[PDB]
Amino acid sequence: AELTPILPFLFLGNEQDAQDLDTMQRLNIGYVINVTTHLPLYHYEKGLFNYKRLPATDSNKQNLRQYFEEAFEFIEEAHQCGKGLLIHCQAGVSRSATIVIAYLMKHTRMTMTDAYKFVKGKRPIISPNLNFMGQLLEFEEDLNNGV
Ligand SMILES: CSc1scc2c1-c1nc(SCC(=O)C(C)(C)C)ncc1CC2
User: Fold this and answer.
1) Contact present, 88 and 12 (Cβ < 8 Å)
2) What is the Cα–Cα distance from 68 to 45, expressed in whole angstroms?
3) Is the Cβ atom of 31 under 6 angstroms away from ligand 1?
Protein backbone atom coordinates (compact mmCIF):
# COMPACT_ATOMS: atom_id res chain seq x y z
CA ALA A 1 0.00 0.00 0.00
CA GLU A 2 1.60 3.24 -1.25
CA LEU A 3 0.22 6.62 -0.12
CA THR A 4 2.07 8.99 -2.39
CA PRO A 5 3.28 12.15 -0.58
CA ILE A 6 2.70 15.03 -3.00
CA LEU A 7 3.33 17.73 -0.37
CA PRO A 8 4.40 17.07 3.27
CA PHE A 9 0.72 17.16 4.28
CA LEU A 10 -1.04 16.05 1.07
CA PHE A 11 -1.29 12.35 0.13
CA LEU A 12 -2.76 10.64 -2.93
CA GLY A 13 -3.96 7.05 -3.19
CA ASN A 14 -6.54 4.66 -4.54
CA GLU A 15 -9.19 2.48 -2.89
CA GLN A 16 -6.59 -0.11 -1.84
CA ASP A 17 -4.30 2.49 -0.27
CA ALA A 18 -7.20 3.97 1.74
CA GLN A 19 -7.81 0.74 3.69
CA ASP A 20 -4.39 0.58 5.39
CA LEU A 21 -5.21 2.05 8.80
CA ASP A 22 -1.69 1.67 10.24
CA THR A 23 0.06 3.59 7.46
CA MET A 24 -2.46 6.43 7.65
CA GLN A 25 -1.66 6.92 11.34
CA ARG A 26 2.09 6.75 10.65
CA LEU A 27 1.61 9.62 8.17
CA ASN A 28 -0.27 11.76 10.75
CA ILE A 29 -3.40 11.88 8.59
CA GLY A 30 -6.54 13.38 10.10
CA TYR A 31 -8.48 14.38 6.97
CA VAL A 32 -9.81 12.23 4.11
CA ILE A 33 -11.37 13.21 0.76
CA ASN A 34 -13.34 10.41 -0.89
CA VAL A 35 -13.95 11.27 -4.55
CA THR A 36 -16.37 8.42 -5.32
CA THR A 37 -20.12 7.92 -5.08
CA HIS A 38 -20.10 4.27 -4.03
CA LEU A 39 -17.08 3.51 -1.89
CA PRO A 40 -17.48 3.59 1.90
CA LEU A 41 -15.78 6.08 4.16
CA TYR A 42 -13.15 3.65 5.37
CA HIS A 43 -12.70 3.50 9.17
CA TYR A 44 -15.55 5.95 9.72
CA GLU A 45 -16.84 4.12 12.78
CA LYS A 46 -13.45 4.38 14.54
CA GLY A 47 -13.83 8.18 14.95
CA LEU A 48 -10.26 9.04 13.93
CA PHE A 49 -10.60 11.23 10.83
CA ASN A 50 -12.58 14.11 9.39
CA TYR A 51 -14.18 13.06 6.09
CA LYS A 52 -15.47 14.73 2.96
CA ARG A 53 -17.09 12.94 0.03
CA LEU A 54 -17.13 14.51 -3.43
CA PRO A 55 -19.54 12.15 -5.24
CA ALA A 56 -17.96 11.91 -8.69
CA THR A 57 -17.56 9.22 -11.35
CA ASP A 58 -14.65 8.66 -13.75
CA SER A 59 -16.66 9.57 -16.87
CA ASN A 60 -16.45 12.03 -19.79
CA LYS A 61 -19.42 14.02 -18.38
CA GLN A 62 -18.44 14.47 -14.72
CA ASN A 63 -17.95 18.04 -13.48
CA LEU A 64 -15.04 18.23 -11.04
CA ARG A 65 -14.45 22.01 -11.15
CA GLN A 66 -17.58 22.52 -9.03
CA TYR A 67 -15.84 20.70 -6.17
CA PHE A 68 -12.51 22.58 -6.42
CA GLU A 69 -13.23 25.36 -3.90
CA GLU A 70 -14.91 22.90 -1.54
CA ALA A 71 -11.82 20.72 -1.70
CA PHE A 72 -9.34 23.58 -1.28
CA GLU A 73 -10.96 24.77 1.97
CA PHE A 74 -10.67 21.25 3.40
CA ILE A 75 -7.04 20.93 2.32
CA GLU A 76 -6.19 24.29 3.87
CA GLU A 77 -7.93 23.32 7.12
CA ALA A 78 -5.61 20.31 7.51
CA HIS A 79 -2.62 22.30 6.29
CA GLN A 80 -3.16 25.07 8.85
CA CYS A 81 -3.45 22.74 11.85
CA GLY A 82 -0.44 20.52 11.14
CA LYS A 83 -2.31 17.38 10.08
CA GLY A 84 -2.19 15.33 6.91
CA LEU A 85 -4.92 14.87 4.32
CA LEU A 86 -5.52 11.79 2.17
CA ILE A 87 -7.45 12.15 -1.07
CA HIS A 88 -8.29 8.98 -2.95
CA CYS A 89 -10.58 7.57 -5.57
CA GLN A 90 -10.02 4.29 -7.42
CA ALA A 91 -7.47 2.39 -9.57
CA GLY A 92 -6.01 5.03 -11.86
CA VAL A 93 -6.41 7.94 -9.39
CA SER A 94 -7.81 10.08 -12.25
CA ARG A 95 -10.36 11.92 -10.10
CA SER A 96 -8.19 12.55 -7.05
CA ALA A 97 -5.22 13.54 -9.22
CA THR A 98 -7.36 16.26 -10.84
CA ILE A 99 -8.14 17.85 -7.47
CA VAL A 100 -4.49 17.56 -6.37
CA ILE A 101 -3.23 19.29 -9.51
CA ALA A 102 -5.88 22.01 -9.22
CA TYR A 103 -4.67 22.73 -5.69
CA LEU A 104 -1.06 22.97 -6.90
CA MET A 105 -2.03 25.39 -9.67
CA LYS A 106 -3.91 27.67 -7.28
CA HIS A 107 -1.91 27.47 -4.05
CA THR A 108 1.62 27.02 -5.50
CA ARG A 109 1.18 29.17 -8.68
CA MET A 110 2.47 26.30 -10.85
CA THR A 111 1.32 26.04 -14.42
CA MET A 112 -0.85 23.07 -15.36
CA THR A 113 1.93 21.15 -17.06
CA ASP A 114 4.43 21.88 -14.29
CA ALA A 115 1.85 20.63 -11.77
CA TYR A 116 1.30 17.43 -13.77
CA LYS A 117 5.04 16.74 -14.15
CA PHE A 118 5.40 17.23 -10.38
CA VAL A 119 2.61 14.78 -9.51
CA LYS A 120 3.61 12.22 -12.15
CA GLY A 121 7.14 12.20 -10.74
CA LYS A 122 5.98 10.90 -7.34
CA ARG A 123 3.12 8.62 -8.51
CA PRO A 124 4.09 7.29 -11.95
CA ILE A 125 0.77 5.49 -12.72
CA ILE A 126 -1.96 8.08 -13.41
CA SER A 127 -4.76 7.20 -15.82
CA PRO A 128 -5.71 9.94 -18.30
CA ASN A 129 -9.16 11.51 -18.55
CA LEU A 130 -9.59 13.97 -21.43
CA ASN A 131 -12.61 15.54 -19.75
CA PHE A 132 -10.77 16.31 -16.50
CA MET A 133 -7.79 17.51 -18.59
CA GLY A 134 -10.04 20.05 -20.32
CA GLN A 135 -11.33 21.37 -17.01
CA LEU A 136 -7.83 22.02 -15.66
CA LEU A 137 -7.07 23.96 -18.86
CA GLU A 138 -10.06 26.24 -18.26
CA PHE A 139 -9.06 26.43 -14.60
CA GLU A 140 -5.59 27.63 -15.62
CA GLU A 141 -7.12 30.36 -17.78
CA ASP A 142 -9.41 31.52 -14.97
CA LEU A 143 -6.43 31.72 -12.61
CA ASN A 144 -4.43 33.83 -15.08
CA ASN A 145 -7.40 36.22 -15.55
CA GLY A 146 -8.03 36.76 -11.82
CA VAL A 147 -11.37 34.94 -11.58
C1 LIG B 1 -2.72 18.18 -16.92
S2 LIG B 1 -2.58 16.53 -17.55
C3 LIG B 1 -1.48 16.68 -18.95
S4 LIG B 1 -0.93 18.25 -19.40
C5 LIG B 1 0.01 17.65 -20.70
C6 LIG B 1 -0.07 16.29 -20.82
C7 LIG B 1 -0.92 15.72 -19.81
C8 LIG B 1 -1.13 14.28 -19.78
N9 LIG B 1 -1.77 13.71 -18.75
C10 LIG B 1 -1.97 12.37 -18.72
S11 LIG B 1 -2.82 11.63 -17.34
C12 LIG B 1 -3.36 12.88 -16.16
C13 LIG B 1 -4.88 13.23 -16.33
O14 LIG B 1 -5.45 12.98 -17.36
C15 LIG B 1 -5.71 13.92 -15.22
C16 LIG B 1 -4.87 14.20 -13.97
C17 LIG B 1 -6.25 15.20 -15.75
C18 LIG B 1 -6.89 12.98 -14.86
N19 LIG B 1 -1.53 11.56 -19.72
C20 LIG B 1 -0.89 12.09 -20.77
C21 LIG B 1 -0.67 13.45 -20.83
C22 LIG B 1 0.05 14.04 -22.02
C23 LIG B 1 0.63 15.45 -21.84
Assistant:
1) yes
2) 27
3) no
